[PDB]
RNA sequence: CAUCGGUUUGGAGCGGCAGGAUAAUGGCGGAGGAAUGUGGCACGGCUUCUGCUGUGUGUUAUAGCCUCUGACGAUACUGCCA
RNA sequence: ACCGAACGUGAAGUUAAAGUGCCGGAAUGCACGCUCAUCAGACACCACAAAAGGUGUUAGUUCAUCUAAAUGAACUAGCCCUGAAAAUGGAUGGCGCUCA
RNA sequence: CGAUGAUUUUUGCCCUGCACAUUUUAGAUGGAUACGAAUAAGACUUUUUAGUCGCUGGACCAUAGCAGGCUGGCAACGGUGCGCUUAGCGGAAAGGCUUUGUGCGCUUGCCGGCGGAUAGCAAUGUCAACAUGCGCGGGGAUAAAUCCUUUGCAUACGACUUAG
């Protein structure tokens, strides 16, 4: 409808410094550094003070304005991943065949190896994204821990694990086997 | 420049029974006086049972804007015909003259409703004196405190086909 | 109307036109992809088809009915006397494809490979490569500069080799000359090896 | 610190000085909508104009109320010395220099050529001694 | 000096034409530096020479000339209509012509 | 708007059809045109859509003999050439002469690497398209339909840009030196007299 | 090349006159009003009030605006100039 | 066979219908909006599309709950999307065009 | 489209200097004047706070002299044209961008002396790049292909693979 101005406020906490130039966003915190490129969006940024940043769209229509909240949420995930971390938990679900999951290394590169899924002889390997750590949890039986600074990478790599274990040619309501994301939270609470 | 506002005054031709027929006035938005009188007769023939042949135009006069350099918000009430029926609607415009707002309304109903000039009756054009009389947000957002806004992505219009310097859009 | 019954096409559309080949020597359309870490080595060789014979062999394929049993197989014999390296060609990458920059030849060429540059050898003065051999005599600095060019600019290096057809029972005296791409190492290693 | 780089856009707002027809100055008095404003100045006619027909300048008339009439705008304009601020800007100097150049006769252009010859002689002498 | 030009550069663009029929008697000429009908009106009535080279010498010269004159403007982009003593041959579409400064009114 | 001996256009960021129409009219009027960096040309619309359009183009071929059919060139400069030829009466001798005045290239080959390149504002994408619209880079489209030399052109363009940056650094150093020399000889009698004349 | 006659296309053309709400405006003088409320004052989060700042009250004050009107003076628009 | 206009042989001027990004003479002319389509659309006769759907977007109508900071329901009609399947490769005339 | 070998003992061929004369031209008539990238961005200075620039190339460079003659002085020791020389860089289609000394010229940076008429009041009023040929001059090199006979890895005939 061509709204004259739309604003969003980024709350940037005590231990972070969000550096922005030409829609390239670099968020430094106690757990490291995260970068995001936003050259595909027409937005502008204002430093209100050290603890707040204003994000603005001028003369935007409905969809251009819809992108504004998305921009703010993405940068906020950057901040909360550089200060609090991100941790996704996966549980192994099976009826008869135990799912054997190991973190192996080939070509000097880390992989997640899933064996005996529904008794299949095929072995499944999922490449581990950069900055994402996998860890077989010890407190809980049959649980995988996916952690990292980037919410996007951690969630995508957990989804890669969940999608590789789809059941074919069966009633999935009955054959409920798989590896599913059970908890989505933060490393430090 | 497309339109002017006219008053058109007319009556029935005097007869022995009615020597002093009533005078009727209309406010007509027209390109010229020929169209103005035509619109007057069109509306008088729809409202009252009077034809052009038994009446006469008494007066045609330009009505100029009182304050042509004062920014105003206008409310306009309309009856228009769509492809499928007849509808009433009310819209708001910002301009410095009534004729400017009416020209914008004609463009706007052409653009959004495919409503040609022949399909629109202007019920009433009113200058909205108070900010509370302004109802539509697409005009209400220009009535706020300390209004300011940039004009990003300026495209400069060149007089030559080939430019020896890289394009810029700053402003 | 449709064919009354379905049948596959006769013959392959991928070997068209069914014309005579432009040359009798089959040319290598594509060479193996170059791996830098490997040792410098040739990728092709030229020989002569001599005939076919029969062999007997023990088969090693577990799960086959003929596992650890003798099979009789047809085989082909290719007469392959050694080839002689007589030159080197450097190729540069261009937006229009590979382009040969320069070619450097050896000082001495045998009669059989120099017979390749003639249609009437016995009526000729045999002048082929007679002024080129002088480019070595003084100090071979022109040869060194051309090879330095190949090292500086070429991305693909191929060697020029010819067969020794006089070691075959063939009555033909012309040797077959071909380019064989050099794979492995750097371009400098390739030029040195050539 | 966070160090974000902000835009340096010129804003459409009351008091912003504009050029009209590349020749004459004016100031924004009111905003009509996204496309149109009311402008006024001592050397123009108060009018409603499209923003696309005028060019914003980096100069803002300070403390000009919205909807000011012609007398108010002229008084504020004279008090703020907007003409002086504009005439000192390199933009106005370039316009004035182009106008000056376009008035030269053939004989004056000849004089420019000979003066530039002398100028170049001096500049090259300076260049070698550098 | 290095330059000796006393004419304005031009090009033979086209004939007067509709979509399908051409009129060789009128040539459309593009004057260099002229981009509006306002600026083109300076050149109305000025003489135009098309100068070309021919194989056979006439009075010892191989250079031949076809003379014309600017008659009116054409369109909105500063082109002009020209009238030559002999119609310019169509092979000269895209060739250079010379717009003289005379008859002068400066 | 002057008549030039050659006009060399940097094709980067230009919209295909608008540049094509401008260049067609230029060459038809006797102007020689060179367009470089055709791999950097733009087409409006998302990449997938223009890929579908090129595949619709590919589908057209002479049924009785494919070798007589339309020939689908994949290189970006040939895509621009196809756009330009469709705007030329190319079956006339005058049209062939006009097309002989045009040259199109991937990258910036010599001798045009050391010549001035210009832009065409009426065809420039950043000036023409509304800011939110999607567009295609012709180099990416060409690779997706069979152009084989994207990486070669990219490498050679990197090398050219290194050399050009060195050139520009030297030019900038000399320009600064000359500017200092001009400022030193300022407040001179000739300089003041020139300033009175607008120069 | 000059001047004339016939036809015709132009110029940032220049000037005189008439009409209209004897334009409407604007400018000046006077009366009345209000808020997207200026100064002032009272309360606040960030300011060593370093456009800081928001909410209130109220009516020209350390900015202004709107309506009506009184005497002048122009301009646009349309038309005429033998 | 429609629109315009009816015809001796010429010069100059002006037009009708139709047009002015290139092919093609004439503007990438000035302006307000709408539309983004993984079968967009593009001009009378004329070279077709329906019933019916969409929380794509836009503008409107009528009710309702709201400070005891806006929101909810039904609906109208613009463009867009679905409904929309044929045989040689191919047609807004072609190129191509997306604040067109 | 590229690389590479050999290119006539004929008075034929190649390279090169000059001079003269011809033919051709899709169309010279001061100069195609070289960063890259972004565009809701670039650059400069302090300092990341802010100030400034652009808002078109109507720019930059070149531009005075019988189409640019003949002569003389002053100021600076600069600018510039042609011919030699050194060194480096450039392979995307490099064939160009440079740099070192050297010889002869010009210099409008400033001031002088002489010359142009009559082409008659305009007439392109003839000044370019490309190529070729002809006289002289200086360097340099000294082939093959086809027919024919032969072969059969080929073949209707041409063609092809061979040998002489
Ligand atoms: C306003 N009246 C519209 C009329 O304009 C037209 O609408 C078309 C619509 O039918 C087209 O859409 C239709 O036709 C296209 C194709 C055949 O063009 C199909 O791809 C599409 O599936 C089909 N729904 C749509 N793409 C454009 C509208 N203007 O069709 C009739 C109508 C819907 O009444």
Short mmCIF file of N, CA, C and O in Angstrom, two decimals, chain F residues 90-131:
data_model
loop_
_atom_site.label_atom_id
_atom_site.label_comp_id
_atom_site.label_asym_id
_atom_site.label_seq_id
_atom_site.Cartn_x
_atom_site.Cartn_y
_atom_site.Cartn_z
N UNK F 90 18.45 -8.10 -41.75
CA UNK F 90 19.71 -8.79 -42.00
C UNK F 90 19.73 -9.54 -43.31
O UNK F 90 20.80 -9.99 -43.73
N UNK F 91 18.59 -9.69 -43.98
CA UNK F 91 18.52 -10.34 -45.27
C UNK F 91 18.72 -9.37 -46.43
O UNK F 91 18.61 -9.78 -47.58
N UNK F 92 19.00 -8.10 -46.15
CA UNK F 92 19.38 -7.14 -47.17
C UNK F 92 20.88 -6.87 -47.09
O UNK F 92 21.53 -7.17 -46.09
N UNK F 93 21.42 -6.32 -48.18
CA UNK F 93 22.84 -5.99 -48.21
C UNK F 93 23.17 -4.88 -47.23
O UNK F 93 24.23 -4.89 -46.60
N UNK F 94 22.27 -3.90 -47.09
CA UNK F 94 22.45 -2.85 -46.10
C UNK F 94 22.45 -3.41 -44.68
O UNK F 94 23.23 -2.96 -43.84
N UNK F 95 21.59 -4.39 -44.41
CA UNK F 95 21.60 -5.02 -43.10
C UNK F 95 22.86 -5.80 -42.82
O UNK F 95 23.37 -5.79 -41.70
N UNK F 96 23.39 -6.50 -43.83
CA UNK F 96 24.66 -7.19 -43.67
C UNK F 96 25.80 -6.21 -43.43
O UNK F 96 26.69 -6.46 -42.61
N UNK F 97 25.79 -5.08 -44.14
CA UNK F 97 26.79 -4.05 -43.90
C UNK F 97 26.69 -3.50 -42.48
O UNK F 97 27.70 -3.24 -41.83
N UNK F 98 25.46 -3.30 -41.99
CA UNK F 98 25.27 -2.84 -40.62
C UNK F 98 25.79 -3.86 -39.61
O UNK F 98 26.45 -3.49 -38.63
N UNK F 99 25.51 -5.14 -39.83
CA UNK F 99 26.00 -6.17 -38.92
C UNK F 99 27.52 -6.32 -38.99
O UNK F 99 28.13 -6.81 -38.04
N UNK F 100 28.13 -5.92 -40.10
CA UNK F 100 29.58 -5.92 -40.20
C UNK F 100 30.22 -4.81 -39.35
O UNK F 100 31.42 -4.87 -39.08
N UNK F 101 29.44 -3.83 -38.91
CA UNK F 101 29.91 -2.77 -38.03
C UNK F 101 29.87 -3.15 -36.55
O UNK F 101 30.27 -2.33 -35.71
N UNK F 102 29.43 -4.35 -36.21
CA UNK F 102 29.25 -4.77 -34.82
C UNK F 102 30.24 -5.86 -34.46
O UNK F 102 30.52 -6.75 -35.27
N UNK F 103 30.77 -5.80 -33.24
CA UNK F 103 31.60 -6.86 -32.68
C UNK F 103 31.21 -7.10 -31.23
O UNK F 103 31.03 -6.14 -30.47
N UNK F 104 31.06 -8.36 -30.84
CA UNK F 104 30.63 -8.75 -29.50
C UNK F 104 31.60 -9.78 -28.95
O UNK F 104 32.11 -10.63 -29.70
N UNK F 105 31.88 -9.71 -27.65
CA UNK F 105 32.90 -10.53 -27.04
C UNK F 105 32.50 -10.94 -25.63
O UNK F 105 31.84 -10.19 -24.92
N UNK F 106 32.91 -12.15 -25.24
CA UNK F 106 33.02 -12.49 -23.83
C UNK F 106 34.28 -11.86 -23.26
O UNK F 106 35.32 -11.83 -23.91
N UNK F 107 34.18 -11.37 -22.03
CA UNK F 107 35.35 -10.77 -21.42
C UNK F 107 35.74 -9.49 -22.14
O UNK F 107 34.96 -8.88 -22.86
N UNK F 108 36.99 -9.09 -21.93
CA UNK F 108 37.52 -7.91 -22.60
C UNK F 108 38.84 -8.29 -23.28
O UNK F 108 39.91 -8.14 -22.68
N UNK F 109 38.81 -8.80 -24.50
CA UNK F 109 40.04 -9.19 -25.17
C UNK F 109 40.79 -7.98 -25.68
O UNK F 109 40.21 -6.89 -25.80
N UNK F 110 42.08 -8.11 -25.98
CA UNK F 110 42.78 -7.03 -26.66
C UNK F 110 42.21 -6.83 -28.06
O UNK F 110 41.69 -7.77 -28.67
N UNK F 111 42.31 -5.61 -28.60
CA UNK F 111 42.93 -4.42 -28.02
C UNK F 111 42.01 -3.58 -27.14
O UNK F 111 42.40 -2.49 -26.73
N UNK F 112 40.81 -4.09 -26.85
CA UNK F 112 39.81 -3.31 -26.12
C UNK F 112 40.07 -3.25 -24.63
O UNK F 112 39.40 -2.47 -23.95
N UNK F 113 41.02 -4.03 -24.11
CA UNK F 113 41.34 -3.97 -22.69
C UNK F 113 42.00 -2.66 -22.28
O UNK F 113 41.94 -2.29 -21.11
N UNK F 114 42.62 -1.94 -23.22
CA UNK F 114 43.29 -0.68 -22.94
C UNK F 114 42.59 0.49 -23.63
O UNK F 114 43.21 1.51 -23.91
N UNK F 115 41.30 0.34 -23.90
CA UNK F 115 40.49 1.38 -24.50
C UNK F 115 39.38 1.77 -23.54
O UNK F 115 39.04 1.03 -22.62
N UNK F 116 38.82 2.95 -23.78
CA UNK F 116 37.73 3.45 -22.95
C UNK F 116 36.45 2.68 -23.24
O UNK F 116 36.05 2.52 -24.39
N UNK F 117 35.80 2.22 -22.18
CA UNK F 117 34.48 1.60 -22.25
C UNK F 117 33.44 2.57 -21.71
O UNK F 117 33.69 3.29 -20.74
N UNK F 118 32.27 2.59 -22.34
CA UNK F 118 31.18 3.46 -21.93
C UNK F 118 29.98 2.60 -21.53
O UNK F 118 29.96 1.39 -21.72
N UNK F 119 28.98 3.26 -20.96
CA UNK F 119 27.73 2.62 -20.58
C UNK F 119 26.59 3.31 -21.32
O UNK F 119 26.73 4.40 -21.86
N UNK F 120 25.45 2.64 -21.34
CA UNK F 120 24.23 3.14 -21.96
C UNK F 120 23.16 3.26 -20.89
O UNK F 120 22.57 2.27 -20.47
N UNK F 121 22.90 4.48 -20.40
CA UNK F 121 21.96 4.63 -19.28
C UNK F 121 20.56 4.13 -19.58
O UNK F 121 19.90 3.61 -18.66
N UNK F 122 20.07 4.26 -20.81
CA UNK F 122 18.72 3.81 -21.12
C UNK F 122 18.57 2.30 -21.05
O UNK F 122 17.44 1.81 -20.98
N UNK F 123 19.67 1.55 -21.09
CA UNK F 123 19.63 0.10 -21.04
C UNK F 123 20.17 -0.47 -19.74
O UNK F 123 20.13 -1.69 -19.55
N UNK F 124 20.66 0.37 -18.83
CA UNK F 124 21.28 -0.12 -17.61
C UNK F 124 20.24 -0.67 -16.65
O UNK F 124 19.23 -0.03 -16.38
N UNK F 125 20.50 -1.87 -16.13
CA UNK F 125 19.54 -2.56 -15.28
C UNK F 125 19.28 -1.81 -13.98
O UNK F 125 18.13 -1.68 -13.55
N UNK F 126 20.33 -1.33 -13.33
CA UNK F 126 20.16 -0.69 -12.03
C UNK F 126 19.35 0.59 -12.17
O UNK F 126 18.67 1.01 -11.23
N UNK F 127 19.38 1.22 -13.34
CA UNK F 127 18.60 2.43 -13.56
C UNK F 127 17.20 2.14 -14.09
O UNK F 127 16.31 2.98 -13.91
N UNK F 128 16.97 0.98 -14.71
CA UNK F 128 15.70 0.71 -15.36
C UNK F 128 14.74 -0.10 -14.50
O UNK F 128 13.56 0.26 -14.40
N UNK F 129 15.20 -1.18 -13.89
CA UNK F 129 14.31 -2.08 -13.17
C UNK F 129 13.92 -1.50 -11.81
O UNK F 129 14.73 -0.86 -11.14
N UNK F 130 12.68 -1.75 -11.41
CA UNK F 130 12.27 -1.44 -10.05
C UNK F 130 13.14 -2.22 -9.07
O UNK F 130 13.46 -3.38 -9.32
N UNK F 131 13.54 -1.61 -7.95
CA UNK F 131 14.53 -2.24 -7.06
C UNK F 131 14.21 -3.65 -6.60
O UNK F 131 15.14 -4.44 -6.39
#
